Design a protein around this ligand. Sequence first.
Ligand SMILES: Nc1ccn([C@@H]2O[C@H](CO)[C@@H](O)[C@H]2O)c(=O)n1
Ligand SMILES: [Cl-]
Length: 269
Amino acid sequence: HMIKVLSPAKINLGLWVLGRLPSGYHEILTLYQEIPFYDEIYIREGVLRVETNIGIPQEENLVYKGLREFERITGIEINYSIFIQKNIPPGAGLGGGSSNLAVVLKKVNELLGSPLSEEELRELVGSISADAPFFLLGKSAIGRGKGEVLEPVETEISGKITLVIPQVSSSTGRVYSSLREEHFVTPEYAEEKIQRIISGEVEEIENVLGDIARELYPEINEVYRFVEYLGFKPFVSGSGSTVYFFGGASEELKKAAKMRGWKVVELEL
Ligand SMILES: Nc1ccn([C@@H]2O[C@H](CO)[C@@H](O)[C@H]2O)c(=O)n1
Ligand SMILES: [Cl-]
C-alpha cells in the first residue's frame, strides 16, 4: 500500500519586487523553473504523521499544516503517515517545503475521491505558501501577484545548471523585510526583463533579494565570489541561499564545497 512520490525543486530565473502590500507581503514578478532535483516522499496508510530526515517539527511542517486544513475543509480524516527524505535544504530558496505541500496534497486529494477541485486545492496550498501553486503546474511559469498568479511559458533555456548551496539557512521573511524603496521596480521594467530571459538571454537575470541576502548572510557572498572566480556569472534563487550558474562543476569547486560544507547539484535542462 505504501507509495513513493517525488517532490521537485524550483529556481527563480530572475525576481523583481514591485512594492509592499498592506497584508505584509510583497507584490513581485518572477520566472519559476522546475529543476530535476527531488525530495523522496513516502506515503503509507496509518495514523496522521509528517516526519523528515532533518528534524523539522511536525507542527511547523507545511505538509502537516495543509493536511489539517484539508481535514478541516472536508470533514474527512487523513489516515496517512508521511515521511519526507529532504534532499532540498530548507532556506535554500528552492521551494522544497512548498513543493512538498503541493505534491502531497494533490496526491492525498486524489486518493480520497477528489473532494477538492483544482481551484480549491490551489487555494488551499496557496494560502499556506505563495510558491506552492507553481508546483501544481511544474515546468516554466511566470509568477505574478505574490507568485501564486501563474502563466505557463516556453523558455529557450537548456543545458547545464550547477547549484552551489551553502550550509546557512536564508530567512525569506528577514530578506523581504530589508527591502527599501530603491530596490523596487515598475512592472514594465520587470516584464521586459522576463521576456528576454524567456528567449534565452540568461545574462538578463537579476534578483534584488539575492543582493540583500548576500549582505545579511556573508557566506552567500563567499559562494557568489567563488563562482565568479571559477569564470561564471553567478545568479541567486529565491532569497538565497542557493547560488546557481550555467555550467558544470570542476574538481576545484567540488573540493571547495566538500571543505566548506557546500552542496553541489549538477543538473541538465
Ligand atoms: N510574495 C511574497 C512572498 C513572501 N514574502 C515574505 O516571505 C515570508 C515567508 O514566505 C512571508 O511571511 C513574507 O514575509 C513576501 O513578502 N512576499
Ligand atoms: Cl540573480
